[PDB]
């Protein structure tokens, strides 16, 4: 058997106190009034007595929402400590009004002295009523608290190194973290933002960015900070969604401290705000500035207009140069024509790079330093225009914004490759005069290095077209999922690189004694790139290349065979190669497939919002006047606004509050309490 006993002493309640608490629970007003009137004369019952569950008479009155029993218990001067917190958490407007309004009148002789009721508090001691009201998100209680001149402490910077923050973190880290989380939860409520901020959209944007940065910093409390940032973003999108006219939307978007607020939302990564349907409609109307009814048309006329405007690339840019104020020069300033002209210019550059690799132009390959062909002479202005455009993009916008795009790394690499190939071509022209045949050239010839860099730059230029997939409505979310899965591929390739380095080290350490010279082997070649596969594990670089090529099956099985009949070493190397093949083809690749599969399922729900955000970021890049000319031609030589914004935000806040007001065992207990209180009063009167 096992004896059981109450380990921790809870004092038993007396018969009178238990009857009084039961009468308060059942809502019988007359019995509670009789007990309260008998309490002073006889001192029989401690009115501030607790229960087994930690509630007092006042808390039981608050939980049942009996305003009559609540005011009756208040009239006999019961203990009132922390009851306002329970009323605020219960979201009872009348209880909060009673507790606010009754604490002032009729206070005489301090309070009656009471001891040992104060240990048990459900609410934390750091909590204050305005902060808990902000956490509850109730509007009326927040309004009534804000009317009584109440303030909230200001949180410090995340990278704060002052004496008091460091001392509070060292003395009690848990209290500091709980206080900061409670303060940010109070500041992130939609009701407090609507009531105590003159700019709710900008305040919600800044609070969402700060909460996201705090979630990035604080590892322990990441989830609730992410939830707070999502709540602020959804509050901003819901406030934007309450508009009723196009003038209100253009007033909200164009308010400054042209579309300044949209740029501020994009800078703070508010994808829900940017991807709202009305803002998308306004951006579509601005995008198709000179082409009304673009969505109406059948696709053949749209494609014919696109072909006729893309084939007209060399005109309409010189027209802008010669007459910007003319009717023809003004058509290039629209964003759609700008994007189509840039796409046509890049397609022309790609087609010219295809045409440069033909035998019609390339002649007399046996020259050491060859002069540039006419195709290269014409391609050179496009490279210079790309260089001028990239340096102009570096200057305008700042160096701190140029690096956040992540497409500029390929542009920097392409420009470096073009500069390197141009320098190699000019040095080969200047000091490599001659006509030596190509079969006896140096391996480190700058002409060959220049051509290799030109080929790599041509590959980068052709792979630059992936960034235009946001313009279409079908290839955007595909590349968004591709971008997430590329990060997952990098996370896989770290472990793959570690395993490859380990197996390459083992194979090279086993096999590097049996290295043979190129003269002894057939055809005077040495490596895995021969007709007969030579020594593949003779060096660390050759071992790494051989282990890389074994994944695609291009490495044969006889590379592990040596000249001598060392059967044990050959068997050990074959076991090594087989273990590496089993790992890299049975565990790792299938695990990568499983990881990118799981990622896609998560990515798909959000795929549209981020696609619309990327398309909005691409659309507003062409809105400005900086960069009107193409790459081939870019190198050729006020308080009424604030008042209207306040009016629109006022109407939006009222509509959002109406919408949120329009949109459990505690509830039924109210109905039992209301029926029980009515039953006792009917029996008492009758």
Ligand X SMILES: CCCCCCCC/C=C\CCCCCCCC(=O)OC[C@H](CO)OC(=O)CCCCCCCCCCCCCCC
Ligand Y SMILES: CC(C)CCC[C@@H](C)[C@H]1CC[C@H]2[C@@H]3CC=C4C[C@@H](OC(=O)CCC(=O)O)CC[C@]4(C)[C@H]3CC[C@]12C
Ligand Z SMILES: CCCCCCCCCCCCCCCCCCCC(=O)O[C@H](COC(=O)CCCCCCCCCCCCCC)COP(=O)(O)OCCN
- Work out whether 609 is an interface residue with ligand Z (CB under 6 A): no
Name the one residue in this structure whose structure tokens are 């062909």. 373
> Whose CB is nearest to Zn ion?
165
Per the annotation, does 530 bind a ligand?
no
Select from ligand X, ligand Z, ligand Y, none the partner in contact with residue 683, using the beta carbon and a kind-dependent cut-off of 5 to 8 Å.
none
DSSP string, 123-149: S-TT--HHHHHHHHT-HHHHHHHHTT-
Which residue from 409, 465, 498, 501 is in contact with ligand Z, where contact means CB under 6 A?
Answer: 409
Select from ligand Y, ligand X, a second copy, none the partner in contact with residue 116, using the beta carbon and a kind-dependent cut-off of 5 to 8 Å.
none
- Work out whether 165 is an interface residue with Zn ion (CB under 5 A): yes
Of 471 and 562, which has the nearer Cβ to ligand Y?
471
Which residue from 117, 396, 624, 670 is in contact with a second copy, where contact means CB under 8 A?
Answer: 670
Per the annotation, does 393 bind a ligand?
yes
Q: Where are the alpha helices (DSSP H) in 464-566?
A: 476-511, 540-549
CA-nearest of 13, 52, 51, 60 to 32 is 60
- Work out whether 587 is an interface residue with ligand X (CB under 6 A): yes
Q: Shortest distance, CB of residue 393 to Ca ion, whole angstroms?
A: 5
Q: Is 369 exposed, middle or buried (0-12, 13-18, 19+ CB in 10 A)?
A: middle
- Choices 121-129, 146-154, 225-233, 408-416; region in contact with Ca ion by CB under 5 A: 408-416
- Work out whether 594 is an interface residue with ligand X (CB under 6 A): no
Q: Shortest distance, CB of residue 165 to Zn ion, whole angstroms?
A: 3
Dihedral sign, Cα of residue 505, residue 511, residue 513, residue 518: negative
Q: Which two tokens stand for residue 598?
A: 């799981």
Distance CA 43, CA 669 (A): 31
Q: What are phi and psi of 154, to 5 degrees?
A: -90, 125
Q: Shortest distance, CB of residue 479 to ligand Z, whole angstroms?
A: 5
* Segment (H or E) for 646: helix 639-662
Q: Shortest distance, CB of residue 336 to ligand Y, whole angstroms?
A: 6
- Work out whether 493 is an interface residue with ligand Z (CB under 6 A): no
Q: Shortest distance, CB of residue 357 to ligand Z, whole angstroms?
A: 16
- Work out whether 406 is an interface residue with ligand Z (CB under 6 A): yes
Which residue from 195, 468, 499, 607 is in contact with ligand Y, where contact means CB under 6 A?
Answer: 468
Helices then strands, counting H and E runs in the chain, come out as 30, 0
Select from ligand Z, Ca ion, Zn ion, none the partner in contact with residue 160, using the beta carbon and a kind-dependent cut-off of 5 to 8 Å.
Zn ion
Select from Ca ion, ligand X, ligand Z, none the partner in contact with residue 411, using the beta carbon and a kind-dependent cut-off of 5 to 8 Å.
Ca ion
Contacts of 613 (CB under 8 A, 6+ apart): 266, 271, 274, 275
Question: Half-sphere exposure of 682 toward its Cβ, with a 13 Å CA cutoff?
Answer: 6
Per the annotation, does 390 bind a ligand?
yes
Distance CA 468, CA 345 (A): 13
Q: Contact 266/274 with Cβ under 8 angstroms?
A: yes
CA-nearest of 488, 482, 453 to 466 is 482
Q: Shortest distance, CB of residue 28 to a second copy, whole angstroms?
A: 14
Q: Shortest distance, CB of residue 588 to ligand X, whole angstroms?
A: 7
Select from ligand X, a second copy, Ca ion, none the partner in contact with residue 674, using the beta carbon and a kind-dependent cut-off of 5 to 8 Å.
a second copy
Name the one residue in this structure whose structure tokens are 């593949």. 536
Distance CA 212, CA 231 (A): 11
Q: Shortest distance, CB of residue 291 to ligand Y, whole angstroms?
A: 10
Distance CA 232, CA 272 (A): 11
Q: Shortest distance, CB of residue 50 to a second copy, whole angstroms?
A: 11
Select from ligand X, Zn ion, a second copy, none the partner in contact with residue 653, using the beta carbon and a kind-dependent cut-off of 5 to 8 Å.
a second copy
Give the start-end residues of each E strand in 204-243: none
Per the annotation, does 531 bind a ligand?
no
Q: Shortest distance, CB of residue 420 to Ca ion, whole angstroms?
A: 19
Distance CA 44, CA 323 (A): 101
- Contacts with ligand Z, 410-449, as mask; x by CB under 6 A: x--x------------------------------------
Q: Shortest distance, CB of residue 569 to ligand Z, whole angstroms?
A: 34
Torsion (CA) 453, 457, 458, 463 in degrees, nearest 10:
140
Q: Which two tokens stand for residue 506?
A: 């083992």
Distance CA 656, CA 648 (A): 12
Q: Contact 585/551 with Cβ under 8 angstroms?
A: yes
Site size toward ligand X, by CB under 6 A: 9
Per the annotation, does 408 bind a ligand?
yes
CA-nearest of 363, 151, 232, 279 to 609 is 279
Of 574 and 636, which has the nearer Cβ to ligand X?
574
Q: Contact 432/479 with Cβ under 8 angstroms?
A: no
To the nearest 10 degrees (0 to 180), the angle between helices 139-146 and 129-136 is 150
Site size toward a second copy, by CB under 8 A: 30
- Work out whether 403 is an interface residue with ligand Z (CB under 6 A): no
CA-nearest of 511, 503, 499, 505 to 559 is 511
- Work out whether 582 is an interface residue with ligand X (CB under 6 A): yes
Site for a second copy in 101-160 (CB under 8 A): 120, 122
Distance CA 151, CA 142 (A): 12
Longest dimension (CA), the chain: 125
- Work out whether 471 is an interface residue with ligand Y (CB under 6 A): yes
Which residue from 75, 285, 575, 598 is in contact with ligand X, where contact means CB under 6 A?
Answer: 575
Which residue from 103, 156, 247, 267 is in contact with Zn ion, where contact means CB under 5 A?
Answer: 156
Of 189 and 457, which has the nearer Cβ to ligand Y?
457
Q: Which residues here bind a second copy, judged by CB under 8 A?
A: 8, 53-54, 120, 122, 553, 653-655, 657-659, 661-662, 665, 667-668, 670-672, 674-676, 678-679, 681-683, 685-686
Residues making up the annotated binding site for Zn(2+) are 156, 160, 162, 165
Q: Which residues here bind ligand Y, judged by CB under 6 A?
A: 306, 343, 465, 468-469, 471-472
Residues making up the annotated binding site are 156, 160, 162, 165, 390, 393, 408, 411
Residues making up the annotated binding site for Ca(2+) are 390, 393, 408, 411
Q: Which residues here bind ligand X, judged by CB under 6 A?
A: 571, 574-575, 578-579, 582-583, 586-587
């Amino acid at each position: 058997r096992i004896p059981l006993q109450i380990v921790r002493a809870e004092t038993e309640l007396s018969a009178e106190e238990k009857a009084f608490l039961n009468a308060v629970e059942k809502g019988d007003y007359a019995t509670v009034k009789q007990a309260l009137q008998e309490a002073e004369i006889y001192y029989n019952v401690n009115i501030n007595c607790m229960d087994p569950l930690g509630r007092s008479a006042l808390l039981i009155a608050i939980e049942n929402e009996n305003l009559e029993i609540m005011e009756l218990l208040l009239n006999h001067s019961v203990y009132v400590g922390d009851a306002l917190l329970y009323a605020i958490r219960k979201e009872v407007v009348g209880a909060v009004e009673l507790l606010l309004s009754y604490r002032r009148p009729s206070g005489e002789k301090q309070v009656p002295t009471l001891m040992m009721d104060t240990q048990f508090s459900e609410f934390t001691p750091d909590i204050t009523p305005i902060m808990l009201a902000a956490h509850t998100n109730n509007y009326e209680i927040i309004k009534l608290l804000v009317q009584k001149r109440v303030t909230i402490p200001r949180p410090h910077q995340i990278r704060c190194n002052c004496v008091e923050c460091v001392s509070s973190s060292e003395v009690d880290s848990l209290r500091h973290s709980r206080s900061r989380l409670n303060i940010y939860k109070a500041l992130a409520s939609p009701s407090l933002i609507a009531l105590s901020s003159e700019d709710p959209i900008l305040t919600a944007f800044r609070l969402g960015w700060e909460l996201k940065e705090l979630s990035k910093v604080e590892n322990e409390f990441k989830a609730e900070y992410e939830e707070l940032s999502q709540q602020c973003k959804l509050f901003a999108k819901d406030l934007l969604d309450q508009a009723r006219s196009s003038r209100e939307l253009e007033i909200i978007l164009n308010h400054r401290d042209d579309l300044a607020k949209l740029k501020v939302a994009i800078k703070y990564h508010q994808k829900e705000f940017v991807a709202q349907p009305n803002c998308q409609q306004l951006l579509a109307t601005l995008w198709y500035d000179g082409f009304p009814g673009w969505r109406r048309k059948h696709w053949v006329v749209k494609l014919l207009t696109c072909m006729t405007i893309g084939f007209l690339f060399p005109m309409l840019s010189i027209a802008y140069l010669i007459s910007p104020r003319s009717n023809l020069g003004l058509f290039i300033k629209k964003p759609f024509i700008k994007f189509i002209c840039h796409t046509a210019s890049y397609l022309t550059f790609l087609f010219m790079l295809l045409l440069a690799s033909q035998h019609i132009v390339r002649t007399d390959l046996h020259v050491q330093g060859p002069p540039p062909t006419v195709v290269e002479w014409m391609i050179l202005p496009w490279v210079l225009g790309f260089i001028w455009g990239e340096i102009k993009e570096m200057w305008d916008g700042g160096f701190t914004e140029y690096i956040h795009d992540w497409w500029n790394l390929m542009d920097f690499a392409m420009n470096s490759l073009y500069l390197a190939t141009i320098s190699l071509k000019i040095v080969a022209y200047v000091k490599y005069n001659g006509s030596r045949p190509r079969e006896e050239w140096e391996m480190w010839h700058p002409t060959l290095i220049a051509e290799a860099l030109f080929a790599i730059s041509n590959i980068l230029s052709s792979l630059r077209l992936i960034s235009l997939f946001t313009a279409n409505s079908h290839l955007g979310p595909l590349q968004i999922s591709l971008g997430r899965m590329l990060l997952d591929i990098l996370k896989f390739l770290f472990i793959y690189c570690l395993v490859l380095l380990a197996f390459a080290n083992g194979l090279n350490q086993l096999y590097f004694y049996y290295e043979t010279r190129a003269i002894d082997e057939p055809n005077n070649c040495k490596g895995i790139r021969c007709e007969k596969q030579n020594n593949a594990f003779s060096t660390l670089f050759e071992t790494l290349q051989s282990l890389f090529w074994s994944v695609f099956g291009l490495l044969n099985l006889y590379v592990t065979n040596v000249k001598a009949r060392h059967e044990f070493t050959e068997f050990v190397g074959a076991t090594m190669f087989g273990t590496y093949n089993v790992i890299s083809l049975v565990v790792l690749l299938n695990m990568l497939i499983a990881m990118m599969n799981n990622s896609y399922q998560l990515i798909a729900d959000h795929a549209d919002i981020e696609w619309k955000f990327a398309r909005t970021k691409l659309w507003m890049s062409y809105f400005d006047e900086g960069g009107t000319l193409p790459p081939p031609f870019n190198i050729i030589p006020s308080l009424i606004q604030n008042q209207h914004y306040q009016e629109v935000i006022r109407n939006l806040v009222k509509r959002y509050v109406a919408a949120m007001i329009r949109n459990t065992e505690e509830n039924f207990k109210e109905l039992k309490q209301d029926i029980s209180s009515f039953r006792y009063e009917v029996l008492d009167l009758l």
